[PDB]
CSV table of N, CA and C and ligand atoms in Angstrom, one decimal:
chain,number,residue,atom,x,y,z
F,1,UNK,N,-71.4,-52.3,-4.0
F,1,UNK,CA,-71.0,-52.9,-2.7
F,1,UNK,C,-72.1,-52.6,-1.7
F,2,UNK,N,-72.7,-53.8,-1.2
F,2,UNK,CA,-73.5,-53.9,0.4
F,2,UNK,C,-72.9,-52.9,1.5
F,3,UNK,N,-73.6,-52.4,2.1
F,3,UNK,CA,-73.1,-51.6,3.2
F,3,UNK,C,-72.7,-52.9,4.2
F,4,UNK,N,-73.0,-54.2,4.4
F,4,UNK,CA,-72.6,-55.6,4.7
F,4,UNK,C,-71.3,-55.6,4.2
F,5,UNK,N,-70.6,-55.2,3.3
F,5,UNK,CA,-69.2,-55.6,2.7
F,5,UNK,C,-69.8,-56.5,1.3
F,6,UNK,N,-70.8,-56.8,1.0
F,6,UNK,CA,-70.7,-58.2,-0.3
F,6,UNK,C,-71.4,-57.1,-1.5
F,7,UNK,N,-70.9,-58.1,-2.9
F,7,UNK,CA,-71.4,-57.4,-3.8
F,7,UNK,C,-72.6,-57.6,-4.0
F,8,UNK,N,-73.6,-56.7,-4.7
F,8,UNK,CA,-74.8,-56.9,-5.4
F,8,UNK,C,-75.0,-55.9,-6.6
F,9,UNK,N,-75.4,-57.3,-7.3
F,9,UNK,CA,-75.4,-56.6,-8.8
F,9,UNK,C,-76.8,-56.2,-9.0
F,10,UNK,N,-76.9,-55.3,-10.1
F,10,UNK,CA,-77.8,-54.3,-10.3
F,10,UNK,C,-78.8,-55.0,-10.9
F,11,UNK,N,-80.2,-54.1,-10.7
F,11,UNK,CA,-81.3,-54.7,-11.9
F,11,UNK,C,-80.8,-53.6,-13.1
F,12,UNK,N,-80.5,-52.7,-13.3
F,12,UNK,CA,-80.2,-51.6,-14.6
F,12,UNK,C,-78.9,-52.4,-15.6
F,13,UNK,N,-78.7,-53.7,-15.0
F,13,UNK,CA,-77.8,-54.5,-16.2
F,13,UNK,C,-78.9,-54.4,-17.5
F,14,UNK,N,-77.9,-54.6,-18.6
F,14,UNK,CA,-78.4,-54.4,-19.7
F,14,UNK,C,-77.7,-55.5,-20.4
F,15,UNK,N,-78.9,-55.9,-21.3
F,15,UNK,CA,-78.9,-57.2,-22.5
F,15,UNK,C,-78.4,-56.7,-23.9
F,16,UNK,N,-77.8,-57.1,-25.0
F,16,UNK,CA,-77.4,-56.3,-25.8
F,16,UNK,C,-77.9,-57.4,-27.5
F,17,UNK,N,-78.9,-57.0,-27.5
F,17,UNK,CA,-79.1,-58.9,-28.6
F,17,UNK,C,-78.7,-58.0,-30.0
F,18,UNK,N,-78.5,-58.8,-31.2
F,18,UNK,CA,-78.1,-58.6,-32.4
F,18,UNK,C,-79.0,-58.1,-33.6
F,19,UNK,N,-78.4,-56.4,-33.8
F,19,UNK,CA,-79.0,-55.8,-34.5
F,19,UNK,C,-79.8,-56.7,-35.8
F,20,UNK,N,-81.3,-56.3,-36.5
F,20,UNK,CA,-82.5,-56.8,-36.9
F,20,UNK,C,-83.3,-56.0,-37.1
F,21,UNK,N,-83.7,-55.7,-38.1
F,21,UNK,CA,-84.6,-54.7,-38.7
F,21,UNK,C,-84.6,-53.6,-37.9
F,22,UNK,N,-83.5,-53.3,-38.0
F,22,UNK,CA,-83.6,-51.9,-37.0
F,22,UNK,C,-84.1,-52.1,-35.5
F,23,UNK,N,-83.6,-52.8,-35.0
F,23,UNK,CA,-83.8,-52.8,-33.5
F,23,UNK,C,-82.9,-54.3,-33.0
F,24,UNK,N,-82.6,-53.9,-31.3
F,24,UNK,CA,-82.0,-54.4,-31.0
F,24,UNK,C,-82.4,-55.5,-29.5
F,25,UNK,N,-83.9,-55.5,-29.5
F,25,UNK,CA,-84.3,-56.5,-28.4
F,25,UNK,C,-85.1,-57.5,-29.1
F,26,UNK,N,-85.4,-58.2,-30.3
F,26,UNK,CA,-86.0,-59.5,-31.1
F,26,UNK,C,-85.1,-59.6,-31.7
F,27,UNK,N,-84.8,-61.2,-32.0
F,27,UNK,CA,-83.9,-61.7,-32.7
F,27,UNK,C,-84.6,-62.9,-33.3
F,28,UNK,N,-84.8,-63.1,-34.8
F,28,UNK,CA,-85.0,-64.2,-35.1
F,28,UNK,C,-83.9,-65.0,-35.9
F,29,UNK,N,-83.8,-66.2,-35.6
F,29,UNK,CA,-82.9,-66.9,-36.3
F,29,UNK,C,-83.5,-67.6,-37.6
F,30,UNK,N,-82.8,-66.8,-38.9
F,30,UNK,CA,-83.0,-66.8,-40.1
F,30,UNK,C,-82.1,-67.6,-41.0
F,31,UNK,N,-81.4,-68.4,-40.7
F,31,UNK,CA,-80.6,-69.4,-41.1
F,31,UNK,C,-80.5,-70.5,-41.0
F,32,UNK,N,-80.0,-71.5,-42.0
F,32,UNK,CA,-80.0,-73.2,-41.6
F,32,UNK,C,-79.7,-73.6,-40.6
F,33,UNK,N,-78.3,-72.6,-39.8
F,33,UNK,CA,-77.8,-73.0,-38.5
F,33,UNK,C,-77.3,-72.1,-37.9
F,34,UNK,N,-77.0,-72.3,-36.2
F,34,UNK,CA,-76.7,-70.7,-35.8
F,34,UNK,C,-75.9,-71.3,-34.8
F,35,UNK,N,-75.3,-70.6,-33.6
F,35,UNK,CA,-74.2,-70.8,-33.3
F,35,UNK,C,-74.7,-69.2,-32.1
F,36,UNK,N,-74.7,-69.7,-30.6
F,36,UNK,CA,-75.2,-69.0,-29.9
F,36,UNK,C,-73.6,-68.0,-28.7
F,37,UNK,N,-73.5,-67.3,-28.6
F,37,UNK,CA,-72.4,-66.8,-27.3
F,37,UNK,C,-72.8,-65.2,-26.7
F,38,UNK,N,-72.1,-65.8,-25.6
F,38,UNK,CA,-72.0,-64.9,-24.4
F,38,UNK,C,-70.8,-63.6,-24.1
F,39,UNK,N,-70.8,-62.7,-24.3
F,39,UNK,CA,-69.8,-61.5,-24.1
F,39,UNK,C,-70.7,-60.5,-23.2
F,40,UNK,N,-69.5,-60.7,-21.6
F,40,UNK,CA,-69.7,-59.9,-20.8
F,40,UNK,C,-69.1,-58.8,-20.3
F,41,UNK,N,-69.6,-57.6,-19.9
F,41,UNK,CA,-68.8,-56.9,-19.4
F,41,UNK,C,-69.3,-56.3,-18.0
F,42,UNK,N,-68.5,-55.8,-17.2
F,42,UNK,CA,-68.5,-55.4,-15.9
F,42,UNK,C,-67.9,-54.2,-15.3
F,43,UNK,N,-68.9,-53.0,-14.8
F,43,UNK,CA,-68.6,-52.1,-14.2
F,43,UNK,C,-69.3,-51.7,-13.1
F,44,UNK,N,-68.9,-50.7,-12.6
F,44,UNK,CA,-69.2,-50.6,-10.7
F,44,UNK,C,-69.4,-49.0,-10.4
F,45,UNK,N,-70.2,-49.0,-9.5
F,45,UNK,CA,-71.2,-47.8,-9.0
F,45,UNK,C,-70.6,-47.6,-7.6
F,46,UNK,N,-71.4,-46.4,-7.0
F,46,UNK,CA,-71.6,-46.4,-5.7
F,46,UNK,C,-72.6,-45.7,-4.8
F,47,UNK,N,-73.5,-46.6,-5.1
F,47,UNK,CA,-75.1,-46.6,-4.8
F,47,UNK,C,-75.8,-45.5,-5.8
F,48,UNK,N,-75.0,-44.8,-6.3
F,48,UNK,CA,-75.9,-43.9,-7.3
F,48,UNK,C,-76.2,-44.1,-8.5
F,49,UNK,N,-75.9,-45.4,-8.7
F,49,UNK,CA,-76.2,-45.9,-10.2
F,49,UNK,C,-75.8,-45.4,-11.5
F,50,UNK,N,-74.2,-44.8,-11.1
F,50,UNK,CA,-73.3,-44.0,-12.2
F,50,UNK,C,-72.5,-45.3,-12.5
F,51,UNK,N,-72.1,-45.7,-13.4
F,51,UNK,CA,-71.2,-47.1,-13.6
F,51,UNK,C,-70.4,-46.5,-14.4
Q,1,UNK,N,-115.4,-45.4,-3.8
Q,1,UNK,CA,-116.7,-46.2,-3.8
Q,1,UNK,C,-117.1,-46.1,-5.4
Q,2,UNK,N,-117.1,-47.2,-5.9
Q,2,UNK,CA,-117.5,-47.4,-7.5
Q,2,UNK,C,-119.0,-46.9,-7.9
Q,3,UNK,N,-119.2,-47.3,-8.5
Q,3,UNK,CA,-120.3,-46.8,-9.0
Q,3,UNK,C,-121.7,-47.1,-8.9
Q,4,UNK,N,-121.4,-48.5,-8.8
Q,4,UNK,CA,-122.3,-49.2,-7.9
Q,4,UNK,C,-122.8,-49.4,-6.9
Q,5,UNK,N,-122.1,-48.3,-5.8
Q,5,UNK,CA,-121.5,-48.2,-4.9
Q,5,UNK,C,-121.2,-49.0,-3.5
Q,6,UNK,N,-120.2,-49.9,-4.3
Q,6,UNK,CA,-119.2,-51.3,-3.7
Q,6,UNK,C,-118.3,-50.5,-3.4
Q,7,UNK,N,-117.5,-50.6,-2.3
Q,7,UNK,CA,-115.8,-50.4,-2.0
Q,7,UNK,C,-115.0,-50.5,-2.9
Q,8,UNK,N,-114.2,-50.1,-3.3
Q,8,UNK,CA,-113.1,-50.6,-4.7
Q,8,UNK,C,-111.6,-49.9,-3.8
Q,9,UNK,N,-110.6,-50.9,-4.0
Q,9,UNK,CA,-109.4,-50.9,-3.4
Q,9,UNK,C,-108.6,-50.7,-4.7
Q,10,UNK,N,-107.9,-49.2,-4.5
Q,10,UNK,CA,-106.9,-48.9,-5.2
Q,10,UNK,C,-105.5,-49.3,-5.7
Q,11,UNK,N,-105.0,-49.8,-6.7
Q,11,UNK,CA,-104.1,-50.1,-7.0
Q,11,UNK,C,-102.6,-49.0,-6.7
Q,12,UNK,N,-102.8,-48.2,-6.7
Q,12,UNK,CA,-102.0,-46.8,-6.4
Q,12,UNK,C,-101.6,-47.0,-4.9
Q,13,UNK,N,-102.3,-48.2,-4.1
Q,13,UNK,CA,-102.1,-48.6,-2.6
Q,13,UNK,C,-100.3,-48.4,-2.7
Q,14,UNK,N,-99.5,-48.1,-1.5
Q,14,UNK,CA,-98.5,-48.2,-1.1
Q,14,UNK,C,-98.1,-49.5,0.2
Q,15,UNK,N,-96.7,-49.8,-0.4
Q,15,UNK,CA,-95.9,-50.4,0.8
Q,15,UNK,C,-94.4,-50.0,1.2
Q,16,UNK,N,-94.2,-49.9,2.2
Q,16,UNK,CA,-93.2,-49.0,2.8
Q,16,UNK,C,-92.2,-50.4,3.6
Q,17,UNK,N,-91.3,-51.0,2.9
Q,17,UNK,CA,-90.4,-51.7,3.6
Q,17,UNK,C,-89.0,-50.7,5.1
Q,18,UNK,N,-88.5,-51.5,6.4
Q,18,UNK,CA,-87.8,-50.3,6.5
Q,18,UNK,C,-86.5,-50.0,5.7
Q,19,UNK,N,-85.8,-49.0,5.9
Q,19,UNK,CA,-84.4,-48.3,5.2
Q,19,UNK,C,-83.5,-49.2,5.4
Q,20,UNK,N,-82.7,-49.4,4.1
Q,20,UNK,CA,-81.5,-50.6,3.9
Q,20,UNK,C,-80.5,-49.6,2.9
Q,21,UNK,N,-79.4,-49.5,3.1
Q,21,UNK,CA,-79.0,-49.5,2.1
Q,21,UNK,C,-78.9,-48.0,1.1
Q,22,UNK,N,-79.7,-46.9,1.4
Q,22,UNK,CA,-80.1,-46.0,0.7
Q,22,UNK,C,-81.3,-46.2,0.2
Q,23,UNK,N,-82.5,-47.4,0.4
Q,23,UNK,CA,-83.6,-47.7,-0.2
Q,23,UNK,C,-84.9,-47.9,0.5
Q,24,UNK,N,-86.1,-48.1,0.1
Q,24,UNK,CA,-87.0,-49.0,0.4
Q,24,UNK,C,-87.7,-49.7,0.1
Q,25,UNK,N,-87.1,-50.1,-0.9
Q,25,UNK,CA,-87.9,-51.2,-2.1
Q,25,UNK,C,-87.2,-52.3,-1.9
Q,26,UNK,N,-86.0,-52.7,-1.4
Q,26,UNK,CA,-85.3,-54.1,-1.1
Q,26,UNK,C,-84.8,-54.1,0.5
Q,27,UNK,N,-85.8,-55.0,1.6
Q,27,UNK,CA,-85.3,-55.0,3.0
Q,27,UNK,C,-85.0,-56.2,2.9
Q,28,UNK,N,-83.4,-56.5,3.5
Q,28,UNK,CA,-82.8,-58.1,3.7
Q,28,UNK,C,-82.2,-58.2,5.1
Q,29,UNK,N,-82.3,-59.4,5.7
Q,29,UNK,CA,-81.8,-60.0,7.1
Q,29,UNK,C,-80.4,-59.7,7.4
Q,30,UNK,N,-79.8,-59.0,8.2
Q,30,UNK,CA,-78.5,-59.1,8.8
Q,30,UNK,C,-77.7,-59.2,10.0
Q,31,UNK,N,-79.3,-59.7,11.0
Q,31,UNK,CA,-79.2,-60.6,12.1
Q,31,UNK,C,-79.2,-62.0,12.1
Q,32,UNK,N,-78.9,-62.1,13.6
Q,32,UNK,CA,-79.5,-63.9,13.9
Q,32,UNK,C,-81.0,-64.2,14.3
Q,33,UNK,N,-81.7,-63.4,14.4
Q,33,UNK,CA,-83.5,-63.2,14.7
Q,33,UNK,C,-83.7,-62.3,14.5
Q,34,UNK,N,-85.1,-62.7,14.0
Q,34,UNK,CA,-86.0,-61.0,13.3
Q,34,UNK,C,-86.9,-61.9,13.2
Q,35,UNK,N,-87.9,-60.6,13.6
Q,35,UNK,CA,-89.6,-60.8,13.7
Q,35,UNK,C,-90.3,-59.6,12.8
Q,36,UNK,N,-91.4,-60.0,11.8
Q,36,UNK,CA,-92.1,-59.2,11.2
Q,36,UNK,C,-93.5,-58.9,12.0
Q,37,UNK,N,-93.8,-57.5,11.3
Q,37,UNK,CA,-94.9,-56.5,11.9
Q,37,UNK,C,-95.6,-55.6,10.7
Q,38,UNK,N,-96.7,-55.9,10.3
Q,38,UNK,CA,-97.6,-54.9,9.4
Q,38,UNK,C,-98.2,-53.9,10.1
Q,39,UNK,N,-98.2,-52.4,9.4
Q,39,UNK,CA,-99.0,-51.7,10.0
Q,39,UNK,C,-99.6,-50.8,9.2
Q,40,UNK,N,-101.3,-50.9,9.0
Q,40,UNK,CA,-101.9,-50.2,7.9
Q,40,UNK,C,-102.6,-49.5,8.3
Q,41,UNK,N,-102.9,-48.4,7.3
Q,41,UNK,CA,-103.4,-46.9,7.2
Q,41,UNK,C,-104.2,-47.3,5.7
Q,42,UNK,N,-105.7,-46.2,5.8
Q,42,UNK,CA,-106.7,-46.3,5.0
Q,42,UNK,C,-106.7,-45.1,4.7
Q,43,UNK,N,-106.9,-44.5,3.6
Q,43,UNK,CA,-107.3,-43.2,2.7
Q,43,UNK,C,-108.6,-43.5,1.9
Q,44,UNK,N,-109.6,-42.2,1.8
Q,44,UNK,CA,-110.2,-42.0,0.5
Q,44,UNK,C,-110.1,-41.3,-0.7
Q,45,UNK,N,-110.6,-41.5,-1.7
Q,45,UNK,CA,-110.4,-41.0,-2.6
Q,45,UNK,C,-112.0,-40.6,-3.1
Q,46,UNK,N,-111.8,-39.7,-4.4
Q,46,UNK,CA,-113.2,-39.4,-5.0
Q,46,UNK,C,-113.5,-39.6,-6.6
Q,47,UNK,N,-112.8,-41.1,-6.9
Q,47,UNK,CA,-112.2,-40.6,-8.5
Q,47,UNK,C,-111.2,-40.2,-9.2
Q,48,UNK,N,-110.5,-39.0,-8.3
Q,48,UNK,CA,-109.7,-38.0,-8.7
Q,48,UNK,C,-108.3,-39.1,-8.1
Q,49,UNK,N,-108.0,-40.0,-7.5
Q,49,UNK,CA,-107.0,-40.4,-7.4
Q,49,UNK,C,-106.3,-39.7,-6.4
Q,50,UNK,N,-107.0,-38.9,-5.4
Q,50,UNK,CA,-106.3,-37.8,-4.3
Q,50,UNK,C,-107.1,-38.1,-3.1
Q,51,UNK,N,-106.2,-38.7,-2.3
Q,51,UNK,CA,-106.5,-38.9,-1.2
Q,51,UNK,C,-106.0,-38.3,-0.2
B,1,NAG,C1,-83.3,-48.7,-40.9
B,1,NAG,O1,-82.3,-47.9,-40.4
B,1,NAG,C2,-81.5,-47.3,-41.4
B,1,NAG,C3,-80.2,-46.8,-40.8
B,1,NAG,O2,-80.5,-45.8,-39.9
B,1,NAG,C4,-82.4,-46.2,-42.0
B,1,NAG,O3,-81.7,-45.5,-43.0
B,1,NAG,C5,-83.6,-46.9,-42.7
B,1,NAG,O4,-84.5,-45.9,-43.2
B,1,NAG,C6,-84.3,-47.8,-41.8
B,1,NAG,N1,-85.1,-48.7,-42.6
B,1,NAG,C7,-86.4,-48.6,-42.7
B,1,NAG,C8,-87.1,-49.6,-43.7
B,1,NAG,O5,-87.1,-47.9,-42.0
B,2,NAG,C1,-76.7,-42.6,1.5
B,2,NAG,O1,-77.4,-41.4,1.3
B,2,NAG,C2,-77.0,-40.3,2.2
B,2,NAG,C3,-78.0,-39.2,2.1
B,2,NAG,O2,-79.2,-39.6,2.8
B,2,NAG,C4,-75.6,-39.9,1.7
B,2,NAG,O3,-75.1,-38.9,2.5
B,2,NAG,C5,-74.7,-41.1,1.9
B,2,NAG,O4,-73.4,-40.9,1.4
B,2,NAG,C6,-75.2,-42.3,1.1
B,2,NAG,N1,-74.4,-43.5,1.4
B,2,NAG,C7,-73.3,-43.8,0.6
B,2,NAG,C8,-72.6,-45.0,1.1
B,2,NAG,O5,-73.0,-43.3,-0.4
């Protein structure tokens, strides 16, 4: 929360892509067909970047 | 002064936004007018990166 009252979201959000040779930021799609989604989650700080 | 001995301008240069927030890396508007002002300062160095 802004010292304004509004929210603002962090840059320390984190992306979470699908484990791959042992790691989890490249993904190649290795299949005839694929099928893409979104799962989010949301938590909250207070200015000290503890969530 | 490089080696050549041309001027060379440091990447290690600083900018100082004012205090928002707990910060100084993000200054945002929360008036109805505002006017901007730069104000610069010069250091040397000798190589060593210590000015
Ligand atoms: C990939 O991770 C597994 C599980 O930790 C590990 O046992 C394996 O050695 C790793 N594979 C390679 C080829 O390094
Ligand atoms: C901002 O930092 C100060 C220390 O300079 C601290 O006392 C204060 O609680 C912080 N503000 C908030 C809203 O946590």
């Amino acid at each position: 929360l802004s010292g304004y009252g509004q929210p603002i979201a962090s840059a320390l959000s984190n992306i979470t892509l699908p484990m791959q040779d042992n790691n989890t930021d490249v993904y190649c799609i290795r299949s005839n067909q694929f099928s893409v989604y979104v799962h989010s989650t949301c938590k909250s700080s207070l200015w000290d970047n503890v969530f």
